[PDB]
């Protein structure tokens, strides 16, 4: 567990319907919801491989599991029953434990993705914005739509807004 | 001032999954790894149709029972379909030697 | 005249899933039979709306 989901980011967003992770913005032009395409796409690729690996490694050969034995062959009936029951036991236990562990790993993967997105935005903004908790940054300057898209698309240009931010940070 | 928040997705899904640390976890999306449904009908296998015995049994069909005329033509089948309790087998009472072995060897031809 | 990869006495299975719980006695390249009633793999996130 990494602390983002059900942690310092308490709840999810019903309004964000285009991705798993993203951003809410409140500028004077307006508020909105935008999914982070890069991180969500990486997660999609990972989970798709995960599912395809769990599904596609079950390559079975043409087999018939039904046999008929008379009464004078009862040891054979019991040996066949032991074989079938043992295989069913092994596969049931393996499938259950596989799903149980794989689900925990998937949830941890999503939690890691949200924290890394948060860390990336934090490192991008540096001291031009303040952490107001709940995974939100309050800016020390005015960001228009271009500023918000720069933060989202990964090219924030800190020196452009640093000096003005100082006049708001030391005040 | 101007703020940007980082968060995650949520929807109206009621799907629940079981994890090693918690049971009945509601999740946004899930996939099924278990098949629980069937067609209800017999299908072909490896492109080769099955052999349907009707009311005849394997012994009756292979001995040529008088009441077994409809099932007379076949070249290659992938498996045999038989009724749970066939009523036209060995019309003359008697013992069939190695019946189970014969059934095994006539399973697919 | 349907075509299937596995045949079951209650009816064929047209699926590519790795596991099934219809009937242990099956003919063909079949999903492995398990005694599980649920096999759901989380692909998404916890739902906290």
């Amino acid at each position: 567990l990494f602390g983002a989901i059900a942690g310092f980011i308490e709840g999810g967003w019903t309004g964000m319907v285009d991705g798993w992770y993203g951003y809410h913005h409140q500028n004077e032009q307006g508020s909105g919801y935008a999914a982070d395409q890069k991180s969500t796409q990486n997660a999609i690729n990972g989970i798709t491989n995960k599912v395809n690996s769990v599904i596609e490694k079950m390559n079975t050969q043409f087999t018939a599991v039904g046999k008929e034995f008379n009464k004078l062959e009862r040891r054979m009936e019991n040996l066949n029953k032991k074989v079938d029951d043992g295989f069913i036991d092994i596969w049931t236990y393996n499938a259950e434990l596989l799903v149980l562990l794989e689900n925990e790993r998937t949830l941890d993967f999503h939690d890691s993705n949200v924290k890394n997105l948060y860390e990336k935005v934090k490192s991008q903004l540096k001291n031009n914005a303040k952490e107001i908790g709940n995974g939100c940054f309050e800016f020390y300057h005015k960001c228009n739509d271009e500023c918000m898209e720069s933060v989202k698309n990964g090219t924030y240009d800190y020196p452009k807004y640093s000096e003005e931010s100082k006049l708001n940070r030391e005040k | 001032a101007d703020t940007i928040c980082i968060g995650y997705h949520a929807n109206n899904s009621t799907d629940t999954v079981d994890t090693v640390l918690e049971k009945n976890v509601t999740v946004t999306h899930s996939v099924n790894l278990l098949e629980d449904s069937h067609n209800g009908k017999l299908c072909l296998l490896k492109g080769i149709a099955p052999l349907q015995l009707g009311n005849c049994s394997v012994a009756g069909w292979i001995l040529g029972n008088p009441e077994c005329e409809l099932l007379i033509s076949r070249e290659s089948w992938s498996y045999i379909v038989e009724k749970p309790n066939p009523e036209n087998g060995t019309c003359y009472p008697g013992h069939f030697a190695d019946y189970e072995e014969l059934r095994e060897q006539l399973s697919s031809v | 005249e349907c075509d299937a990869k596995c045949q079951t006495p209650q009816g064929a299975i047209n699926s590519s899933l790795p596991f099934q719980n219809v009937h242990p006695v099956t003919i063909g390249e079949c999903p492995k039979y398990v005694r599980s009633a649920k096999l759901r793999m989380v692909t998404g996130l916890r739902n906290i709306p």
Partner: antibody
Amino acid sequence: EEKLVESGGGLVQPGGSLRLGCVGSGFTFSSAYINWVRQAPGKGLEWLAAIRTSGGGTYYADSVKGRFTISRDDSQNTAYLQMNSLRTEDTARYYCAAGAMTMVVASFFQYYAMDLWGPGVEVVVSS
Amino acid sequence: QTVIQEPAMSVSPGGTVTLTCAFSSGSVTSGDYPSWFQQTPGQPPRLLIYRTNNRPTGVPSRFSGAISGNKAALTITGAQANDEADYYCTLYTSSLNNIFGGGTHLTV
């Protein structure tokens, strides 16, 4: 049964204004990014504008940046392209595209895929 | 900035083609997300390849896409004579900002 239908268009004098509308059916229109693309007669395709979902943002090309505005109304399942100060080079067939391709591991639509297109609407600018 | 593409190209039926799409700039990578479109006369464009190597469900397994050197390549193997159409490439310079190529008229 996914479908997009474009309205508006026709003949408009230079310097005028139009409002093209694309209506979507058969899919969750509020969850899809909507693109507006133009094809001049006897010429290749030219991407014009795009709009995200839930107020994510608007994206414009340099050709019509400042003249053309894009909006959407999810209650009516409509996407609007308002064109202002139309010149003579704006004569084209206009298509609305939607990224509406489903996935297996999520309920969203696939990124970087304009899969659903409309028949188009003709817009001609002359006297 | 501007995307360059072959003005025209012809192939014989039952042959391979190498429809190429390039930048008027440095190398083209998978981060540009090339997408190929097919347009016939009087008809809405159809997506054939998304994100370099992916096919929509309806597209037959005959069109293929890849990155070759610094160019985006689309290849057609079967050439069933219904491929006489204009093939466009789009390159994404941003999350939704994309640039279309000139287009290639393919005569079989």
